[PDB]
């Protein structure tokens, strides 16, 4: 299924995912198309920061759901 991921660069990417995908899986995929290290990534849905071991389906993230991607501040 497809989901959207919005950034603070306002920008929107799409991801193909399964309900059973974990949040670390989703971060892996974001690293793939954007090159952002998972450890820099904060994923947020419906007002909650998403936990790495949970699945999309634990948060009721469904097809066409939208997540927010926020990058931690990291030095060089």
């Amino acid at each position: 299924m497809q989901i959207f991921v919005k950034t603070l660069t306002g920008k929107t990417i799409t991801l193909e995912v399964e309900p059973s995908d974990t949040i670390e899986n989703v971060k892996a995929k974001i690293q793939d198309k954007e090159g952002i290290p998972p450890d820099q990534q904060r994923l947020i849905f419906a007002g909650k920061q998403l936990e790495d071991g949970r699945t999309l389906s634990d948060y009721n993230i469904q097809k066409e759901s939208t997540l927010h991607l926020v990058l931690r501040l990291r030095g060089g």
């Binding site: 950034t7 603070l8 947020i44 849905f45 007002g47 909650k48 920061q49 939208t66 927010h68 990058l71």
Partner: protein
């Protein structure tokens, strides 16, 4: 009755889920549709950049005819937000209308982060620094964002 409020909150929730703002996110804390949590993302070009600020939201039983109660639970250095997380925004008090929505409220708070109101301040001591030494203000606000918001 209050079934009426619930109907409206479900509606706002559905609208949010369909197309949420980029700079904020909200939804029920648990199984009580009257009790929500929100994230406000620190704006770009602000000393809050990179921060994620958590808020608590409680809808009253006669929503949308009274405003929601909204407070920061994350500490933030701002002339219009005090140590109780209480927020100085007219739309949360005298200026509320049943026309407004929770997304409008969170967008107003994003906008407040970008553009403080130091001449009508909640916290005078911070406004003073904002107005006389904006660079120190940006320092302290940045420091709090790093301590509390990540």
């Amino acid at each position: 009755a209050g079934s009426m409020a619930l109907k409206r909150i479900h509606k706002e929730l559905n609208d949010l889920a369909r197309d949420p703002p980029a700079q904020c996110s909200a939804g029920p804390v648990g199984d009580d549709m009257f009790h929500w949590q929100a994230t406000i993302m620190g704006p770009n070009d602000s000393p809050y950049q990179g921060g994620v600020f958590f808020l608590t939201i409680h809808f009253p039983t006669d929503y949308p005819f009274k405003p929601p109660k909204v407070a920061f639970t994350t500490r933030i250095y701002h002339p219009n937000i005090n140590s109780n997380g209480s927020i100085s925004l007219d739309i949360l008090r005298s200026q509320w209308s049943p026309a407004l929505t929770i997304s409008k409220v969170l967008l107003s708070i994003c906008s407040l982060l970008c553009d403080p109101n130091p001449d009508d301040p909640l916290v005078p001591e911070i406004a003073r620094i904002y107005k006389t030494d904006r660079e120190k203000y940006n320092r302290i606000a940045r420091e709090w964002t790093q301590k509390y918001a990540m």
